Write a protein that binds this ligand. Structure first.
Ligand SMILES: CC1=C2C[C@H]3[C@@H](CC=C4C[C@@H](O)CC[C@@]43C)[C@@H]2CC[C@]12O[C@@H]1C[C@H](C)CN[C@H]1[C@H]2C
Ligand SMILES: CC1=C2C[C@H]3[C@@H](CC=C4C[C@@H](O)CC[C@@]43C)[C@@H]2CC[C@]12O[C@@H]1C[C@H](C)CN[C@H]1[C@H]2C
Length: 573
């Protein structure tokens, strides 16, 4: 009979000599020189050396597959046919001459029964129609998926359909457009007033938006008539992976360089921003030429390193080329690490900045507290009947003014005068003279205005400036940290389940490989699908995060003080 009784075990390799196996279970019983599938793969590695003789190889492939890796299903293995074995004798006669034939490969009808249907005869090792979606026939051996011959891994992302591609593309369209013109607004502002806006750290924002403009450009590049497929796909319609490979158009690596470099410089400029703020608070342009070198060296070195390991991959959904898609331990290395370090540094100099801020914020408030005391005490003194209230309030005034006394010598002199006059009024009030002290408090009023009000209203305005700065730092801090937290979350999710998505994808590929033969042989065909895939909402979130940062830094230039600056250049008469 065409069937043999043995125990079916799973394939350790789902490929037979560059051809995908349409079945899932096999048996090592027919390979009489083998006992395990390791041995089988070894023997096939020995038979591999025959590939230098294509004339024989063509005819011996199917036999070798039907023998060493046969279909096992429900305790049965189908034995190869006599007709199949006879097609090996004539051309592979070389095997017979140099070392002879193995006894289990000799065409004795007990090993090869006559007229037996074989699953292998259906399989084509010249992949004319063998290549099955999500795979496409390419005859370039640099695009061949794993060990499969003639088949390449298709260009468009096989985890999301076109219905989702259009979606994400219009999403990225809108967002990146908002960013590309917001950053242009912010550039134009600091550019038209290049003479008056070129200061540090106000030019650091300009540099940030410059970077995030350059990047959004590369993000928009994929929307031209046929540019997307030029960036993402190879010449043979198979997605660009491990770029830059030899003899491929640099239409990918250029976009990668843009999107990555602009991004990284764009986030190191954050650290430079926080430092510049801190040192601005601590009091200059001595280190202003050294920030540059850092913010341009580090992204360069990183990008060059990525190009050195050649781990640029192409995504059709995003429509760009970026680091560490295929191998996700590179994305964590070149994206998550620099961003995290940026978060740490920028956060450090932020809190240092608000310490440098907090220390004065209390001082000015204390001065305001003393002035708050003086006025209300004068309010009580000027309008009182009992001469105990006058004594009391005068003492309190003395305490406050004394506490406030603790170009500068003039300021202290004023409070000398105030304390003195207050003590005079104290002497007057102690003796029970109510209205004499009350009248001697108007002296305190006019003196308060004359000698003290200057330095006070001088330091009255700063509490608005300082609080505004404090709250805008309150914006930037809890904004940037939120963005970093979110993008770290997304990247960590993908980082987490990319170990599973590849499993599911592979199983799916094998399934469709089964479907291929299952259809053109009038055999029952099983439905194939992806068990699990990346969430599109997560990618939505990440994009929203980075573009949201790109927009929020362009929002900074949005002031009413800016709007009028535009008029000066061309208002004329
Ligand atoms: C590759 C090769 C062969 C390896 C095959 C053998 C047929 C049977 C088996 C049994 C199986 O258990 C292990 C594999 C082995 C040995 C076949 C004969 C032809 C050739 O050996 C020649 C040696 C010669 C020096 C050069 N040319 C070499 C090749 C054409
Ligand atoms: C398709 C695919 C992927 C699409 C995913 C990517 C992780 C991150 C993103 C970013 C996100 O914005 C869009 C989706 C995208 C591009 C993931 C990497 C693994 C894989 O590429 C592998 C090639 C490999 C040879 C076989 N296995 C293939 C697939 C598991």
């Amino acid at each position: 009979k065409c069937k043999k009784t043995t125990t079916c075990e799973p394939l350790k390799y789902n490929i037979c000599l560059g051809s995908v196996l349409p079945y899932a279970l096999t048996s090592t019983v027919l390979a009489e020189d083998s006992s395990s599938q390791d041995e089988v793969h070894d023997k096939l590695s020995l038979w591999s050396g025959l590939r230098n003789a294509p004339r024989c190889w063509d005819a011996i492939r199917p036999l070798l597959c039907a023998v060493y890796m046969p279909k096992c299903e429900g305790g049965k293995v189908e034995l190869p046919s006599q007709g199949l074995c006879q097609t090996t004798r004539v051309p592979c006669a070389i095997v017979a001459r140099e070392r002879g034939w193995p006894d289990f490969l000799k065409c004795t009808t007990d090993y090869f029964p006559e007229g037996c249907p074989n699953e292998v005869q259906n399989i084509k090792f010249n992949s004319a129609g063998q290549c099955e979606a999500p795979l496409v026939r390419t005859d370039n051996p640099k695009s061949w998926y794993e060990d499969v011959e003639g088949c390449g891994i298709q260009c468009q992302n096989p985890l999301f359909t076109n219905k989702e591609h259009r979606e994400m593309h219009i999403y990225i369209a809108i967002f990146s457009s908002v960013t590309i013109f917001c950053t242009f607004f912010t550039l134009a502002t600091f550019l038209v007033d290049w003479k008056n806006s070129n200061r540090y750290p106000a030019v650091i924002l300009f540099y940030v938006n410059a970077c995030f403009f350059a990047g959004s450009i590369g993000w928009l590049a994929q929307f031209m008539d046929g540019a997307r497929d030029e960036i993402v796909c190879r010449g043979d319609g198979t997605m660009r992976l491990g770029e830059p490979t030899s003899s491929e158009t640099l239409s990918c690596v250029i976009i990668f360089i843009i999107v990555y470099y602009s991004m990284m410089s764009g986030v190191i400029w954050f650290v430079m921003l926080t430092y510049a703020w801190h040192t601005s608070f601590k009091a200059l342009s001595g280190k202003t030429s050294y920030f540059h070198l850092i913010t341009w060296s580090i992204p360069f070195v990183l990008t060059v390193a990525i190009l050195a390991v050649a781990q640029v991959d192409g995504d059709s959904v995003s429509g760009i080329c970026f680091v560490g898609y295929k191998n996700y331990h590179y994305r964590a290395g070149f994206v998550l690490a620099p961003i995290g370090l940026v978060l740490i540094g920028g956060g450090y100099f932020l809190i240092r900045g608000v310490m440098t801020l907090f220390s004065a914020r209390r001082q000015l408030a204390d001065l305001e507290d003393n002035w708050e005391t003086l006025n209300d005490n004068l309010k009580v003194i000027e309008k009182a009947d009992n001469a105990a209230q006058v004594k009391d309030a005068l003492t309190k005034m003395r305490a406050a003014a004394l506490d406030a006394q603790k170009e500068m010598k003039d300021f202290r002199h004023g409070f000398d005068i105030l304390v003195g006059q207050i003590d005079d009024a104290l002497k007057l009030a102690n003796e029970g003279k109510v209205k004499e002290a009350q009248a001697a408090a108007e002296q305190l009023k006019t003196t308060r205005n004359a000698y003290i009000q200057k330095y006070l209203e001088r330091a009255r305005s700063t509490l608005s400036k300082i609080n505004e700065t404090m709250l805008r730092l309150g914006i930037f801090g809890f904004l940037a940290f939120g963005f970093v937290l979110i993008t770290f979350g997304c990247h960590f999710y993908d980082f987490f389940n990319q170990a599973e998505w590849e499993r599911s994808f592979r199983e799916y590929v094998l399934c469709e490989a089964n479907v291929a033969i299952a259809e053109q042989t009038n055999k029952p065909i099983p439905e194939c699908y992806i068990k699990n895939r990346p969430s599109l909402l997560v990618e939505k979130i990440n994009l929203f995060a980075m573009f949201g940062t790109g927009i929020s830094m362009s929002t900074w230039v949005w002031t009413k003080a800016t709007i009028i600056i535009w008029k000066r250049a061309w208002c004329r008469i």
